[PDB]
Amino acid sequence: HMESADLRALAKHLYDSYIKSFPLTKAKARAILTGKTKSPFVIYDMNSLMMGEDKIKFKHITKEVAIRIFQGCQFRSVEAVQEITEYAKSIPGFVNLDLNDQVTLLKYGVHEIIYTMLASLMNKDGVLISEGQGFMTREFLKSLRKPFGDFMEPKFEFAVKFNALELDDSDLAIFIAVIILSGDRPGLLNVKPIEDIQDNLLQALELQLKLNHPESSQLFAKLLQKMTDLRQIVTEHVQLLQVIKKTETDMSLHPLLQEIYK
Amino acid sequence: HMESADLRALAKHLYDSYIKSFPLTKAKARAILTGKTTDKSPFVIYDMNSLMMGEDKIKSKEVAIRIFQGCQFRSVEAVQEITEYAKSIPGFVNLDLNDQVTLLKYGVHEIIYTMLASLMNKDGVLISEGQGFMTREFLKSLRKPFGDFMEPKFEFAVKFNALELDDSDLAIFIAVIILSGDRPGLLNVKPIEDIQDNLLQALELQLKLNHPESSQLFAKLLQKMTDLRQIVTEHVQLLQVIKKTETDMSLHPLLQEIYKD
Numbered sequence: 467h468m469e470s471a472d473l474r475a476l477a478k479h480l481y482d483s484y485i486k487s488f489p490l491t492k493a494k495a496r497a498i499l500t501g502k503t504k505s506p507f508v509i510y511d512m513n514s515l516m517m518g519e520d521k522i523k524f525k526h527i528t529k530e531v532a533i534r535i536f537q538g539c540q541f542r543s544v545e546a547v548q549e550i551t552e553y554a555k556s557i558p559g560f561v562n563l564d565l566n567d568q569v570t571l572l573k574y575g576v577h578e579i580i581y582t583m584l585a586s587l588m589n590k591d592g593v594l595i596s597e598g599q600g601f602m603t604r605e606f607l608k609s610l611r612k613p614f615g616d617f618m619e620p621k622f623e624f625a626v627k628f629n630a631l632e633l634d635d636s637d638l639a640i641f642i643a644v645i646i647l648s649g650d651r652p653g654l655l656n657v658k659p660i661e662d663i664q665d666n667l668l669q670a671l672e673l674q675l676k677l678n679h680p681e682s683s684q685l686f687a688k689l690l691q692k693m694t695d696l697r698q699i700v701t702e703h704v705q706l707l708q709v710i711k712k713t714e715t716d717m718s719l720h721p722l723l724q725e726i727y728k
Numbered sequence: 729h730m731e732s733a734d735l736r737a738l739a740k741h742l743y744d745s746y747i748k749s750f751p752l753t754k755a756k757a758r759a760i761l762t763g764k765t766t767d768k769s770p771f772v773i774y775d776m777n778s779l780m781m782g783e784d785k786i787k788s789k790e791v792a793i794r795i796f797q798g799c800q801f802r803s804v805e806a807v808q809e810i811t812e813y814a815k816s817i818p819g820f821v822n823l824d825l826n827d828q829v830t831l832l833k834y835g836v837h838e839i840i841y842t843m844l845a846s847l848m849n850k851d852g853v854l855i856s857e858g859q860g861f862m863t864r865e866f867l868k869s870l871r872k873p874f875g876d877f878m879e880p881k882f883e884f885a886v887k888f889n890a891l892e893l894d895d896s897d898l899a900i901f902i903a904v905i906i907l908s909g910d911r912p913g914l915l916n917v918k919p920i921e922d923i924q925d926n927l928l929q930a931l932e933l934q935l936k937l938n939h940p941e942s943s944q945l946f947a948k949l950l951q952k953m954t955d956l957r958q959i960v961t962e963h964v965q966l967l968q969v970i971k972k973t974e975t976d977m978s979l980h981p982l983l984q985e986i987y988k989d
């Protein structure tokens with residue numbers, strides 16, 4: 467169906483575009499998390515949060531602290547959506563799809579991709595922020611009041627298991643493309659070219675994982691099994707947000723801000 | 729990890745055990761559903777009157793309850809058939825005993841949905857070992873919550889059935905579902921994953937040999953193991969709500985144990 471050279475070309479194409487599209491790759495994030503490269507500024511409690519937003523001055527972080535961090539996660543997610551959207555245009559065939567289907571694939575895909583790429587920034591002890599210039603501890607995030615603490619912890623829980631696959635950026639670039647080209651998103655008009663592109667991406671991912679992880683038994687199957695979960699986690703996620711909206715009233719934004727985050 | 733001759737041997741073993749464990753294969757269900765055979769034709773239940781004729785042909789409760797209890801009775805038998813099949817999977821009975829219980833507890837429902845599809849087409853489902861056929865339309869028109877309890881099974885089945893898997897494919901697929909290392913509370917994840925790795929390898933080769941023109945059927949089938957997780961969760965959220973409303977219903981103790989947490 468496809469030749470190995472075409473699959474390697476597709477894989478290289480996607481890695482290159484993935485490098486241009488996302489500000490902090492997994493390779494650089496890991497160097498920061500491990501201690502293998504200016505230490506990031508560490509946020510571990512209320513006082514160090516206050517110094518970090520007065521020193522680094524995070525555009526997301528800057529009345530109650532738990533609310534402020536939660537909304538900072540939203541600000542960054544909105545940024546990620548545009549980065550993923552630009553990445554999608556580099557996937558071969560994507561821009562030739564019907565315009566409504568492009569929108570639909572992005573609309574229902576970004577949540578899964580944001581979770582996936584968040585893991586690249588996370589270890590069991592915390593998460594990089596502001597392009598790796600800061601590090602906020604898991605314990606500080608989990609200890610936020612209300613439901614905000616239990617909103618943060620499931621991301622870490624997923625990340626630790628996903629990170630045990632030890633995927634690198636060239637693996638992730640194809641994996642992310644596969645998620646986008648999901649022919650079962652609701653309301654798609656023309657499923658057939660979407661599945662045709664996804665089939666080529668899956669062949670590419672399969673070959674990429676055998677060449678890059680030749681000792682990792684059935685990694686391909688295990689990664690698709692993670693694409694199973696991601697569906698669940700995302701559904702859990704939206705049910706968490708809606709509960710927050712109906713319970714909390716200290717969370718009103720300028721109506722324009724609400725529209726941006728709609 | 730395993731060689732192809734070993735993978736083909738595992739596939740044949742599993743298909744043999746599957747035939748021995750499940751009385752109504754997909755091959756026989758399809759022969760019944762397709763027809764042009766006088767001897768295998770089912771009696772079709774499509775409304776209240778034909779249900780009552782069916783009990784005098786195929787062989788005090790409100791109709792939706794009676795149908796619902798028929799589903800439970802057969803689900804319990806399915807659990808029994810799946811348990812018997814599971815013990816034939818190499819390595820399964822050598823696992824920690826608590827993990828065997830745990831794998832069955834979280835696996836039977838996903839398997840029941842998978843094998844229910846074999847009995848289904850877009851118009852209804854085989855019952856009574858294929859002697860009867862109850863229409864989708866009749867099931868969906870049951871009152872209360874029972875009508876919409878039936879329909880999602882059909883929605884999954886029409887999509888799963890588009891893969892056109894036969895029984896030798898399904899025997900390996902079902903084994904993979906059972907040997908899932910991510911079930912909550914497992915004690916020894918690694919020996920389960922080691923078994924699943926061999927079953928996945930076996931499934932991969934089996935689908936390439938049996939569906940050589942079916943591009944990426946392996947990946948599409950594992951993606952189906954996605955939905956199944958969703959369907960099962962919707963199922964229990966319906967089943968519990970029904971439990972809280974209806975008391976003319978009692979669940980079989982085997983099923984009761986499975987749904988606890």
Ligand SMILES: N#Cc1ccc2c(c1)c(-c1ccc(C(=O)O)cc1OCc1ccccc1)nn2C(=O)c1c(Cl)cccc1C(F)(F)F
Nearest residue numbers: 535538539540542543546577580581584593595607618621
């Ligand atoms: N620790 C943690 C934590 C917890 C919940 C989170 C996130 C982080 C993030 C997130 C995603 C991507 C990136 C990135 O740099 O690539 C950075 C992120 O946060 C950095 C950050 C950490 C600490 C305080 C402020 C910001 N997103 N998010 C969501 O909740 C989320 C998700 Cl996963 C998917 C879709 C939509 C959303 C959201 F809109 F609702 F936010």
Ligand SMILES: N#Cc1ccc2c(c1)c(-c1ccc(C(=O)O)cc1OCc1ccccc1)nn2C(=O)c1c(Cl)cccc1C(F)(F)F
Nearest residue numbers: 795798799800802803806840841844853855862867878881
């Ligand atoms: N159409 C349809 C329909 C709809 C809901 C159903 C079922 C069928 C079945 C079921 C499962 C396996 C088999 C089999 O022959 O292998 C047969 C089945 O039904 C046949 C049949 C249909 C109509 C009237 C009488 C019998 N089970 N079930 C459940 O609801 C179910 C499930 Cl999936 C898992 C666990 C527990 C349950 C239950 F206890 F709650 F019932």
